[PDB]
Structure formats: structure tokens, C-alpha cells
């Protein structure tokens, strides 16, 4: 067990565990899950109403600063009535640790426009709006970044296939580059690799 195995420590584990329990105690209003990873990065699963109270609490409060905003994407997961996940990553500047606020939502009900507390939130917000479709409450500007202007459909979703429904080509008849429906030459052979026999038995969900 000793050589060539990734070393972990109980010190950061106990520190982050006690800190997450402490945060869950001092905010009983929106905390649901405080999961401590074995590699010591905290995740906190959260209800989508007091998101701005959570962010104002986590920018400050003098026991843990966390002045650094980072990754947020509402990672596309089907099968759930609350599909999308807003995960705000926060990195400290004085204490060197990483916490994630995973609040949940569905498609239609909006999250509440985190630009009011963090200056670096706006293009991230506009990105998530054009890509997933997560709408915002009292937001400055909803435009389209990273997509075509005529394109629609929120293409990062599992609803959206690999190809699009548009295919640009020039013609000299109408003297422009038009978009036609798709004409694929190659299959995109989807190599199915889901082999059986359950390599990780510790992560098995209990069956019926």
C-alpha cells in the first residue's frame, strides 16, 4: 500500500469537515448536503432561493474570506425534475481552500442573477444563458456569446445531438452563404464501451 499510491492526509479532511459542519450549523436555512471529498475539496448542495445571501456570506465573514469567484456551470444532467446544477466555485485568498456551492434548479424556474455581488459574473451568466437556457432575475444584458446569431436550441443539452440542423455553403445563384439541412458523409460510429462487471463496488446504488 505504501509506494506509488497518491498520498492523502487527515488534517485538511478534518479541517474542511469541521468547517462544513460549522457552516451548516450557522446557516440552517438552505444547506442540504455537506459532502467532503476524500481529496479535500468541499461540496455543499443548496436550495435555489437564498443564493445571494449565501454569496454575501461567502465573500466575507472574517473566518474565511473566499474573495475568488470561479466555475459555475449548471452541468447538464437528465432524469431529474430539477435538471440543472449551478455550481459556484469559490477559492480563498488567505486560507487556500476550495469550496463548491452546488445549488439545484430546473429549466424554467430562474436563478437570481449573481452579478449583484461579484463583478466577474456577467459573461459567465450570459454564457450559461446562451448555452443552457438558465434565466435570471433583474439581469442587465442577455445576449448571445459563443454561438451563431441565427442559431437556436441551447446546444450543450442532451436534447441536442452531435450535429446541428444547419450547414453553411456558398452559392452563386443567390450569391451568399446559406444554411441547409445536414448531409453527413461519415456515420460518427458511436463506439459503445460500457463493459460490465462493476469495477467500483463501493459506489453501487441499492437496487429494488
Amino acid at each position: 500500500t505504501r509506494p506509488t499510491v497518491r498520498p492523502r492526509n487527515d488534517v485538511a479532511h478534518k479541517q474542511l469537515s469541521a468547517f462544513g459542519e460549522y457552516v451548516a450549523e450557522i446557516l440552517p436555512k438552505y444547506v442540504q448536503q455537506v459532502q467532503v471529498s476524500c481529496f479535500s475539496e468541499l461540496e455543499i448542495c443548496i436550495h435555489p432561493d437564498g443564493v445571494i445571501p449565501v454569496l454575501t456570506f461567502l465573500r466575507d465573514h472574517s473566518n474565511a474570506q473566499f474573495k475568488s469567484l470561479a466555475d459555475l456551470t449548471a452541468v447538464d444532467i437528465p432524469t431529474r425534475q430539477n435538471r440543472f446544477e449551478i455550481v459556484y466555485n469559490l477559492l480563498s485568498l488567505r486560507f487556500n481552500s476550495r469550496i463548491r456551492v452546488k445549488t439545484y434548479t430546473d429549466e424554467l424556474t430562474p436563478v437570481e442573477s449573481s452579478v449583484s455581488v461579484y463583478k466577474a459574473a456577467n459573461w459567465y451568466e450570459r454564457e450559461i444563458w446562451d448555452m443552457f437556457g438558465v434565466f435570471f432575475a433583474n439581469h442587465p444584458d442577455l445576449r448571445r456569446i459563443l454561438t451563431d446569431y441565427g442559431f437556436e436550441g441551447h446546444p450543450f443539452r442532451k436534447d441536442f445531438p452531435l450535429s446541428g440542423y444547419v450547414e453553411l455553403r456558398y452559392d452563386d445563384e443567390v450569391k451568399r452563404v446559406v444554411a441547409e439541412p445536414v448531409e453527413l458523409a461519415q456515420e460518427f460510429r458511436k463506439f459503445d464501451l460500457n463493459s460490465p462487471w462493476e469495477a467500483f463496488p463501493a459506489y453501487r446504488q441499492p437496487p429494488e
Partner: peptide
Amino acid sequence: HYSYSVVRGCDRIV
């Protein structure tokens, strides 16, 4: 060659 909003080469334009 896949991956939407990418042209399948500049042959489709020039």
C-alpha cells in the same frame, strides 16, 4: 469535422 458551428473545411466557402 463534427461539432456544430464549425465549417467542414474552407471548400464549402472558397
